[PDB]
Amino acid sequence: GFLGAAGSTMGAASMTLTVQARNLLSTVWGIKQLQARVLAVERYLRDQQLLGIWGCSGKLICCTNVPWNSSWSNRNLSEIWDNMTWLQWDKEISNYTQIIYGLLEESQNQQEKNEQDLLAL
Amino acid sequence: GFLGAAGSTMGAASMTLTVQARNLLSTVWGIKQLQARVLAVERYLRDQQLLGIWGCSGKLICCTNVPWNSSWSNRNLSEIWDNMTWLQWDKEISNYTQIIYGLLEESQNQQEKNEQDLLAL
Amino acid sequence: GFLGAAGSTMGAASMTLTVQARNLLSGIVQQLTVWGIKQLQARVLAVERYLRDQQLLGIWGCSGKLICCTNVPWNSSWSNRNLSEIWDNMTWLQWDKEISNYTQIIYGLLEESQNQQEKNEQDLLAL
Amino acid sequence: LWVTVYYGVPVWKDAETTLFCASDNVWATHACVPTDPNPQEIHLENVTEEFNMWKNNMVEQMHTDIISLWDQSLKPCVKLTPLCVTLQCTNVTNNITDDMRGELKNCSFNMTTELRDKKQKVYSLFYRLDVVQINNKEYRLINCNTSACTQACPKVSFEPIPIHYCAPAGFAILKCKDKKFNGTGPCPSVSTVQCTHGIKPVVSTQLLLNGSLAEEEVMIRSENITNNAKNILVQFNTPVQINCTRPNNNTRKSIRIGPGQAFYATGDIIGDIRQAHCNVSKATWNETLGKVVKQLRKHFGNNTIIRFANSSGGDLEVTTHSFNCGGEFFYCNTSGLFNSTWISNDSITLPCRIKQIINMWQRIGQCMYAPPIQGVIRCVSNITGLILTRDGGSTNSTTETFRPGGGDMRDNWRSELYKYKVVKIEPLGVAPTRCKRR
Amino acid sequence: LWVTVYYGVPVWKDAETTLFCASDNVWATHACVPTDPNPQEIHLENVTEEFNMWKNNMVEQMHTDIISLWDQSLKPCVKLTPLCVTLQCTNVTNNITDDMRGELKNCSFNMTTELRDKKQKVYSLFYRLDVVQINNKEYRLINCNTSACTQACPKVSFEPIPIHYCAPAGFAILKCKDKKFNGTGPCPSVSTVQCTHGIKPVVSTQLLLNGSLAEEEVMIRSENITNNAKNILVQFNTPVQINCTRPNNNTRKSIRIGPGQAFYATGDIIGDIRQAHCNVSKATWNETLGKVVKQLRKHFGNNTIIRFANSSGGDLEVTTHSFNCGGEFFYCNTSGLFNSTWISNDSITLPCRIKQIINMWQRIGQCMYAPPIQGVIRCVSNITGLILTRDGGSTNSTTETFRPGGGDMRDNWRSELYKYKVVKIEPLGVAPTRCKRR
Ligand SMILES: *[C@@H]1O[C@H](CO)[C@@H](O[C@@H]2O[C@H](CO)[C@@H](O[C@@H]3O[C@H](CO)[C@@H](O)[C@H](O)[C@@H]3O)[C@H](O)[C@H]2NC(C)=O)[C@H](O)[C@H]1NC(C)=O
Ligand SMILES: *[C@@H]1O[C@H](CO)[C@@H](O[C@@H]2O[C@H](CO)[C@@H](O[C@@H]3O[C@H](CO)[C@@H](O)[C@H](O)[C@@H]3O)[C@H](O)[C@H]2NC(C)=O)[C@H](O)[C@H]1NC(C)=O
Ligand SMILES: *[C@@H]1O[C@H](CO)[C@@H](O[C@@H]2O[C@H](CO)[C@@H](O[C@@H]3O[C@H](CO)[C@@H](O)[C@H](O)[C@@H]3O)[C@H](O)[C@H]2NC(C)=O)[C@H](O)[C@H]1NC(C)=O
Ligand SMILES: *[C@@H]1O[C@H](CO)[C@@H](O[C@@H]2O[C@H](CO)[C@@H](O[C@@H]3O[C@H](CO)[C@@H](O)[C@H](O)[C@@H]3O)[C@H](O)[C@H]2NC(C)=O)[C@H](O)[C@H]1NC(C)=O
Ligand SMILES: *[C@@H]1O[C@H](CO)[C@@H](O[C@@H]2O[C@H](CO)[C@@H](O[C@@H]3O[C@H](CO)[C@@H](O)[C@H](O)[C@@H]3O)[C@H](O)[C@H]2NC(C)=O)[C@H](O)[C@H]1NC(C)=O
Ligand SMILES: *[C@@H]1O[C@H](CO)[C@@H](O[C@@H]2O[C@H](CO)[C@@H](O[C@@H]3O[C@H](CO)[C@@H](O)[C@H](O)[C@@H]3O)[C@H](O)[C@H]2NC(C)=O)[C@H](O)[C@H]1NC(C)=O
Ligand SMILES: *[C@@H]1O[C@H](CO)[C@@H](O[C@@H]2O[C@H](CO)[C@@H](O)[C@H](O)[C@H]2NC(C)=O)[C@H](O)[C@H]1NC(C)=O
Ligand SMILES: *[C@@H]1O[C@H](CO)[C@@H](O[C@@H]2O[C@H](CO)[C@@H](O)[C@H](O)[C@H]2NC(C)=O)[C@H](O)[C@H]1NC(C)=O
Ligand SMILES: *[C@@H]1O[C@H](CO)[C@@H](O[C@@H]2O[C@H](CO)[C@@H](O)[C@H](O)[C@H]2NC(C)=O)[C@H](O)[C@H]1NC(C)=O
Ligand SMILES: *[C@@H]1O[C@H](CO)[C@@H](O[C@@H]2O[C@H](CO)[C@@H](O)[C@H](O)[C@H]2NC(C)=O)[C@H](O)[C@H]1NC(C)=O
Ligand SMILES: *[C@@H]1O[C@H](CO)[C@@H](O[C@@H]2O[C@H](CO)[C@@H](O)[C@H](O)[C@H]2NC(C)=O)[C@H](O)[C@H]1NC(C)=O
Ligand SMILES: *[C@@H]1O[C@H](CO)[C@@H](O[C@@H]2O[C@H](CO)[C@@H](O)[C@H](O)[C@H]2NC(C)=O)[C@H](O)[C@H]1NC(C)=O
Ligand SMILES: *[C@@H]1O[C@H](CO)[C@@H](O[C@@H]2O[C@H](CO)[C@@H](O)[C@H](O)[C@H]2NC(C)=O)[C@H](O)[C@H]1NC(C)=O
Ligand SMILES: *[C@@H]1O[C@H](CO)[C@@H](O)[C@H](O)[C@H]1NC(C)=O
Ligand SMILES: *[C@@H]1O[C@H](CO)[C@@H](O)[C@H](O)[C@H]1NC(C)=O
Ligand SMILES: *[C@@H]1O[C@H](CO)[C@@H](O)[C@H](O)[C@H]1NC(C)=O
Ligand SMILES: *[C@@H]1O[C@H](CO)[C@@H](O)[C@H](O)[C@H]1NC(C)=O
Ligand SMILES: *[C@@H]1O[C@H](CO)[C@@H](O)[C@H](O)[C@H]1NC(C)=O
Ligand SMILES: *[C@@H]1O[C@H](CO)[C@@H](O)[C@H](O)[C@H]1NC(C)=O
Ligand SMILES: *[C@@H]1O[C@H](CO)[C@@H](O)[C@H](O)[C@H]1NC(C)=O
Ligand SMILES: *[C@@H]1O[C@H](CO)[C@@H](O)[C@H](O)[C@H]1NC(C)=O
Ligand SMILES: *[C@@H]1O[C@H](CO)[C@@H](O)[C@H](O)[C@H]1NC(C)=O
Ligand SMILES: *[C@@H]1O[C@H](CO)[C@@H](O)[C@H](O)[C@H]1NC(C)=O
Ligand SMILES: *[C@@H]1O[C@H](CO)[C@@H](O)[C@H](O)[C@H]1NC(C)=O
Ligand SMILES: *[C@@H]1O[C@H](CO)[C@@H](O)[C@H](O)[C@H]1NC(C)=O
Ligand SMILES: *[C@@H]1O[C@H](CO)[C@@H](O)[C@H](O)[C@H]1NC(C)=O
Ligand SMILES: *[C@@H]1O[C@H](CO)[C@@H](O)[C@H](O)[C@H]1NC(C)=O
Ligand SMILES: *[C@@H]1O[C@H](CO)[C@@H](O)[C@H](O)[C@H]1NC(C)=O
């Protein structure tokens, strides 16, 4: 359905990411609904721009050369991709997001400075 | 300039795809303009979301690999790019596009296996 | 900060290009009344400008990259200074006056180079 | 371990948004978009959502939308500002019955006509609850000491129609599906939906009418069951039928007050004069009260004597059960229903009464003139919920008495929006993995 | 043998949108978007689209646009509610000729002044088609049992001004250029355009005035021709000049009716009062009627005698010509123009009467007082069309009688917006050629 994998295994929930990704776009009832849909466009464009700073424009799954600092989560791989759901995973990491966004941004910033002089030959 | 490439052959319309694409985003009588610009923004973001989901994003000729048959047209390339136009081609595919749009929902499956599964040391 | 080191040299602003890009859309805390309709017009205009600039980046096959190169030739009538005095002791502000009236053919040359490159890639991968 | 990024994960946080409505009169749906047929519903399985029916923000948005849309529907009707010239009213007494004597008045005032240099002496019939004495004795309307009432122009009807609340892009509506649900706490089975069901904005103050029923037992919902300052709310399992009607044969006449504005006054009554009756079956109400008292004592004790007394309101709207009957507004005594004590084809009749000047949403300086409806009127409805109020004497006692109440219209729609909440999807997410970007 | 996906291809399909583009008054050209010089009229290649004239949404959208624009421009003006008083009236008797006797009436009444305790006795000249006897005789205005009016402010004038029509971003307007076009069917001359040509919102009911000309011959364009009900609109190849004038000197008074509101009443007439002759020439009219009657019998009959007659309408607007000549609305007989029985410097001066209270875009109870214009006025315009209607029974016909008629304001905008249709782009196109992404 729309988000029918929202309670399933976090490994198995990532097989159907597009059905969440599809439906982010979709007088009393004048300015209010116009403001609602302009705010939806604003949120989607902010999301796509923040994904585009990281070097992941047009990609649903990436990788990036940042190391995972264990202070965020000491749990290893044998308890994360098997019997938990994305809601508890967001609830555990909810105050560790700004620093990893900043490190990801600085890694892309360092990444983008290392090809333009190798392409200058 | 603008769409005076209709009526011309498929083989001649493929070299002019962008001049028809850069003119897609460019009190009464005042609110109507706001609704028009908002609607244009919605259509452009929907089209770009479909291209981003399909894997090929930002590319005019974004050749993917979903197989054909005789059911989703059997007309060979010896006639549909020497004589036949885009407008007539839209007519004969008009009730067949939906499953092909559905069949293009595999980019996510083969980017979780080319990035998330592979490239692991 | 926003417009940080805008008066610096050509190469000094190259590492501070990302700071402008986030703030061309909006803020979040700043997201009936004559203030409201003007704020709505300003928000729609900002979205319009950012989407237009991103589309103009996307035509030339350079989307997602702040720094990029293109293989279309540069005519000598447009400029004559070499690389020595343009990337050093030259602020970005004094660059647009001499290339004011040539840009509309620059965009077409970029478009034709990208379309020819895309058709060449389609012809090559079809084998 | 190296970090990957995902876009489009099913993660939702609580948020505030402006929902838009959809449908299939005052509740004008000509400015509302049509709804879709067969709206999809997805049964999420391994989720536990912490619902809260008493702090959700869609109820306030519903109240604001109803108020603003009501004011929008009141704009293209007659202003009726020059009406309240000093009235002279006699007792109408023709072959009127013994009770409700001296209720209707025969007022004889005079008014401006289409030409703005003549007048005309007219007569109208008014209730006692619309006129006060200013000192035959002279009378004036109760309204124009504070403000001038606005007529409800007679093309518009007051019948409720269902309204479905949708959600915009990025926001999801989660619907409760636990069958034992007191409105607060976690829910084991949660399902999502894009559209709410048919929610008619019914008007009531003590007895919830035409609502959505329960499924297994009668349920009890409150803020704090040991606190007596919060309105306890009960929802029935089976409906009880109610028949409120007005027996007299009134007629309407058109009186012109200017070039194109007409005021509809009550004409001479054909026949006799009788008060408006309201009927509820006795044994079915006794069985329903038995169900309520059986479900009430699970919160207080197995030996507590439970009593029901009549209401103790100050104004008319809290004292009397009030609703609408397609144009006429009723006010019912309802003392013969809540009068019993419980220890561990006859029909009860209620003298429902009629008022015309309506100050409805409790705003200072705005009101209604409802025109009379020609002929007899009949309404057949059914009671779904009650809004009771505890009378808490002391701790560890053996007797609790319950009284009807309300007046605040947020609690009327809180019994229909309990199994709904709105969340905002945040599709970004990060996770550790083994992969590397090239 | 695999799909490829293409972006930006020249496919399209039909749609409907909301439009703009004013020029480079009531038709407000201050709150708009100015047009560009040198529009992009790009001639397309072999495509043939099925243009329809009778089903495009643009005509209805234009009608709604002019209505909303009209009654927003009449909003900040004087509401003539004190004008409904009693009028005692007498005949005007000054230098009255054989005609115009009793067409004007000298009326005297009462009207309030700035200081709202003191009245005054003022006098004015109303027309015969504006007052109704109520039964030296008393009178009232004709529009004082439905609704009070709104006097048109003299600052805002209502001469026709050119506007244009865009398509929004992501849409396009396809324009016909074939020289023989019968309304429906295909067209091998399709070309796109951004803003349309100089469309002019003229208001007429029997004879199209000041509009877009034809280019090779007179073109008959209609529905299914066997129907007697459908209008059969004719477009002339060459214009014919029309001069309609009022040869009466008028004096505009400034009768003050409130604290800053003025009712501009007609004063006495300087000189003699003559009937408004409303002129057209014989020779060019006879020549153009010859061209039109030659181009009827192409598809109607072959040699049946074609005759005209004068109109047969119920109200005033359908049965006679109606047009603007600067705020002083005319009504010309047009009965000497259709009195021929065609078989196969002198003038056709018309009695062209006149009225002040107007009610156009017919709605129940919205009048508009048109203030008088001082001096004499004369308009030199030209006929660019016909709004005839066929009337006759016999299938095996020996004759066909055409009678003009008209009305229905929608048809005056489907006469000059015929060569236009809006379309939707939809740039994505899927399954070209052999490929195989690595
Ligand atoms: C629901 O309502 C009950 C009352 O029906 C609330 O419990 C009461 O809470 C108050 C405030 O904390 C307590 O008062 C305090 O008690 C002692 C002396 O008895 C002392 O610590 C303070 O001076 C203060 O007065 C009260 O004892 C307690 N219980 C009763 C039976 O009244 C309860 O908090 C409410 N629940 C919620 C969630 O709000
Ligand atoms: C709730 O129910 C009680 C009990 O049935 C009602 O109280 C009764 O109210 C009536 C009102 O007419 C009282 O009658 C009047 O009382 C005195 C008698 O001295 C006299 O002025 C009149 O002749 C008339 O009979 C009646 O006495 C009173 N009963 C008691 C025991 O006080 C009450 O009205 C109901 N309340 C509501 C809000 O519905
Ligand atoms: C609760 O729902 C019931 C559903 O039956 C409502 O009763 C219905 O009320 C409407 C509006 O008053 C009645 O419509 C009217 O009926 C007659 C005949 O058509 C006429 O007076 C009007 O033209 C209008 O259509 C309807 O007949 C009536 N239905 C029945 C079966 O009696 C009731 O009003 C609702 N109660 C509320 C909102 O308190
Ligand atoms: C709501 O209904 C209650 C039902 O008890 C009403 O209370 C009763 O009202 C009557 C009439 O005013 C009181 O008078 C009694 O009536 C009969 C003769 O009609 C007779 O039994 C007595 O001689 C006496 O006059 C009666 O005392 C009173 N109470 C009871 C317990 O019956 C009440 O008035 C109604 N309230 C409203 C606001 O309409
Ligand atoms: C269309 O043309 C016909 C033919 O001329 C017009 O009919 C004419 O109408 C006038 C005014 O109503 C009639 O005059 C009156 O006639 C009677 C009988 O003689 C009498 O009461 C008076 O002498 C008065 O003048 C006239 O006779 C009549 N002509 C004929 C031949 O019937 C008609 O009015 C025109 N209609 C329109 C809408 O233009
Ligand atoms: C169709 O064509 C003619 C072309 O002349 C239009 O006539 C023009 O009408 C306007 C508006 O009434 C006149 O403008 C005003 O005229 C007077 C002086 O006559 C004065 O108040 C102002 O200077 C103002 O310009 C204009 O003079 C008149 N043109 C001529 C040459 O006399 C006509 O209105 C068009 N429309 C219709 C519905 O006939
Ligand atoms: C309009 O249609 C005619 C059809 O004959 C086109 O003329 C030829 O079409 C064939 C096949 O369609 C081509 O191989 C030829 O090259 C065409 N000849 C010429 C001189 O054009 C004609 O080209 C069509 N017009 C357009 C713009 O495509
Ligand atoms: C209300 O009072 C008016 C008078 O103010 C009554 O109207 C009169 O009724 C009598 C009796 O039928 C007639 O003879 C008169 O001609 C009526 N006069 C007018 C002006 O209508 C009216 O009947 C009273 N209404 C009642 C008692 O319900
Ligand atoms: C409510 O119930 C009462 C009591 O049964 C009904 O009153 C009786 O109605 C019948 C029929 O109209 C009359 O013949 C009787 O005289 C009434 N009984 C009395 C006055 O004691 C009443 O009609 C019912 N109301 C409804 C069904 O709307
Ligand atoms: C309220 O009114 C309804 C409609 O008249 C009553 O329902 C009727 O009850 C009688 C009882 O003998 C049945 O014969 C009818 O078939 C019922 N009709 C319908 C349409 O259901 C109802 O009894 C009344 N409620 C009371 C008196 O409490
Ligand atoms: C219409 O009638 C009015 C009176 O109701 C006339 O006004 C009078 O005209 C005479 C002659 O000019 C003056 O001496 C009076 O002073 C006027 N009286 C007032 C009160 O102003 C008016 O002239 C008539 N209009 C015509 C015949 O066109
Ligand atoms: C309309 O046509 C009539 C008839 O040709 C004209 O009226 C005549 O005009 C001449 C020239 O000025 C005068 O000598 C005559 O006395 C008029 N005859 C009448 C009034 O019966 C009239 O001028 C024309 N009007 C216009 C605006 O062209
Ligand atoms: C309508 O008015 C025009 C403009 O005045 C008239 O054209 C005039 O025609 C006469 C004919 O003798 C010429 O001498 C004038 O030079 C023309 N005027 C101009 C300004 O060119 C026209 O004839 C009138 N139409 C009628 C009366 O039917
Ligand atoms: C990991 O995080 C801790 C706590 O913030 C910090 O002290 C440490 O330096 C980090 N280690 C890294 C970045 O290797
Ligand atoms: C982050 O949240 C967790 C869970 O609530 C909490 O234990 C921790 O202290 C928080 N960290 C900071 C720095 O606030
Ligand atoms: C698509 O439409 C054509 C034209 O009617 C029809 O022949 C064909 O069967 C349709 N394809 C379907 C229904 O799959
Ligand atoms: C650029 O070209 C425009 C267009 O002719 C002209 O007006 C302008 O002067 C030119 N500027 C320079 C510096 O040549
Ligand atoms: C009119 O009603 C009042 C209030 O009940 C009463 O005092 C008065 O006596 C009545 N008059 C008549 C004539 O019945
Ligand atoms: C009341 O009704 C009766 C019966 O219809 C009728 O004859 C009478 O005139 C009325 N008035 C009185 C005082 O009885
Ligand atoms: C609702 O029921 C739950 C589950 O037993 C309980 O935790 C909660 O306190 C109850 N709330 C009320 C107001 O009774
Ligand atoms: C009410 O009076 C009217 C007019 O006499 C009559 O036609 C109608 O039947 C009456 N209604 C009832 C329910 O008696
Ligand atoms: C209310 O109940 C009491 C007993 O508590 C009883 O005496 C009385 O008659 C009842 N009144 C009504 C109107 O039912
Ligand atoms: C006024 O006009 C009427 C209309 O026919 C006429 O009967 C009457 O004689 C006229 N009076 C004068 C004085 O002209
Ligand atoms: C109102 O009009 C009447 C009739 O002409 C007249 O008697 C009276 O004096 C006028 N003026 C007033 C009341 O000021
Ligand atoms: C016909 O009217 C137009 C305006 O609609 C005007 O410009 C023109 O001069 C007139 N005469 C012609 C074409 O002879
Ligand atoms: C217009 O021409 C088409 C050509 O197919 C014809 O079928 C139709 O009847 C014509 N319509 C009219 C109104 O002449
Ligand atoms: C019909 O019209 C055509 C074309 O004018 C003509 O040649 C033919 O003779 C006519 N036939 C008849 C029977 O009138
Ligand atoms: C109207 O009368 C005035 C009076 O001064 C005169 O000057 C003017 O020329 C007249 N207008 C005409 C006859 O058109």
Question: Which run of H or E residues covers position D424?
Answer: strand D421-425
Query: If we measure between CA atoms, which residue out of D120, D124, D89 comes closest to residue D267?
Result: D124
CA atoms within a 13 Å half-sphere pointing along the CA-CB vector of E220: 20
Sheet containing D150-151: order of strands: D150-151, D368-369, D357-358
Angle at B106 between CA B105 and CA B111, to 5 degrees: 130
Nearest ligand 14 atom, CA A69 = 1
The answer to whether the CB of B86 falls within 8 A of the CB of E46 is no
**Look-up of token digits 């504006």:** E130
Resolution of the PDB structure in angstroms? 3.7
Angle between helices A31-53 and A97-111 (to 10 degrees): 60
Going from the C-alpha of E82 to that of each of B56, D113, E109, E263, the distances in angstroms are 72, 12, 11, 10
Strand partners, D166: none
The token pair that represents E408 in the structure block = 């229905």
* DSSP string for residues in D224-259: -TT-SSS-EEEEEEEEEEEEEEE-SB--EEEEE-SS
Question: Taking CB atoms and an 8 Å cutoff, what residues of chain D touch E144?
Answer: 114-115, 259
Cα separation, D436 vs E159, whole angstroms: 73
| Whether B30 contacts chain C with CB within 8 A | no
Residue D343 — φ and ψ, nearest 5°? -115, 135
Strand partners, B1: none
User: Residue E288 carries which side chain, given as an amino acid letter?
Assistant: T
Give pairs for D375-379: CB < 8 Å, separation 24+.
D375/D249, D375/D250, D376/D245, D376/D246, D376/D247, D376/D248, D376/D249, D377/D245, D377/D246, D377/D325, D377/D326, D377/D327, D377/D328, D378/D243, D378/D245, D378/D325, D379/D243, D379/D244, D379/D245, D379/D325, D379/D326
Distance from chain centroid for Cα D17: 24
- E283 burial (CB, 10 Å; 0-12 / 13-18 / 19+) is exposed
Question: Taking CB atoms and an 8 Å cutoff, what residues of chain C touch A34?
Answer: 40
Using CB atoms, pick whichever of A58, A109, A116 lies closest to residue C18: A109
The answer to whether the CB of E157 falls within 8 A of the CB of E174 is no
Count of Cβ atoms closer than 10 Å to residue B120 Cβ: 12
Question: Which run of H or E residues covers position D433?
Answer: strand D428-433
For testing contact with chain D, the best of B115, B118, B121 (most D CBs within 10 A): B115
Ligand 9 pocket, D237 CB below 6 A?
no
The token pair that represents D67 in the structure block = 């108020």
Cα separation, E392 vs E228, whole angstroms: 8
Q: How many residues does chain D have?
A: 438
- D4 burial (CB, 10 Å; 0-12 / 13-18 / 19+) is buried
Expressed in angstroms and rounded, the spacing between residue E303 Cα and the centre of ligand 27 is 8
User: Residue A72 carries which side chain, given as an amino acid letter?
Assistant: W
Bridge-based pairing state of the strands D33-34 and D21-23: parallel
Breaks in chain C, named by the residue before each, with C–N above 2.5 Å? 31
Cα separation, D178 vs D214, whole angstroms: 12
Query: If we measure between CA atoms, which residue out of D389, D293, D298, D279 comes closest to residue D337?
Result: D279
The answer to whether the CB of B33 falls within 8 A of the CB of E176 is no
Going from the C-alpha of E401 to that of each of D389, E299, E301, E395, the distances in angstroms are 82, 15, 12, 13
The token pair that represents B48 in the structure block = 């770009």
The answer to whether the CB of E169 falls within 8 A of the CB of B24 is yes
**Look-up of token digits 């096959």:** C61
Ligand 11 pocket, E106 CB below 6 A?
yes
Distance from chain centroid for Cα D125: 28
Bridge-based pairing state of the strands E352-354 and E191-193: unpaired
The token pair that represents D278 in the structure block = 């309201």
| Whether E13 contacts chain C with CB within 8 A | no
Query: If we measure between CA atoms, which residue out of D157, D154, D163 comes closest to residue D31?
Result: D163
Angle between helices C34-59 and A31-53 (to 10 degrees): 40
Count of Cβ atoms closer than 10 Å to residue E438 Cβ: 5
The token pair that represents E94 in the structure block = 């000054």
**Look-up of token digits 């469309």:** E199
Contact flag for D and C (3+ C-beta pairs < 8 Å): no
Going from the C-alpha of A114 to that of each of C10, C67, D25, D236, the distances in angstroms are 18, 11, 68, 71
The token pair that represents A46 in the structure block = 């902010």
Assign C95 to helix, strand or coil: helix
Tell me which ligand sits closest to the C-alpha of residue D229.
1
The token pair that represents C86 in the structure block = 């343009």
Going from the C-alpha of C47 to that of each of C17, C23, C27, E204, E330, the distances in angstroms are 20, 11, 12, 45, 52
Method: cryo-EM
**Look-up of token digits 């004795």:** D137
Cα separation, D286 vs D241, whole angstroms: 13
**Is the Cα dihedral D363, D369, D372, D373 positive or negative?**
negative
* DSSP string for residues in E98-109: SSSTTTEEEEEE
CB contact under 8 A, B121 and D438: no
Contact flag for C and E (3+ C-beta pairs < 8 Å): yes
| Whether D163 contacts chain A with CB within 8 A | no
Going from the C-alpha of D2 to that of each of A84, A102, D390, the distances in angstroms are 20, 15, 60
Maximum CA extent, chain E: 101
Distant-in-sequence, close-in-space partners of D305: CB < 8 Å, separation ≥ 6: D341, D342, D343, D344, D398, D399, D400
Q: Which protein residue's CA is at the shortest distance from atom 7 of ligand 28?
A: E375
**Is the Cα dihedral E426, E431, E435, E438 positive or negative?**
positive
**Three-class SS string for A51-72?**
HHHCCCCCCCECCCCCECCCCC
The token pair that represents D112 in the structure block = 């401006």
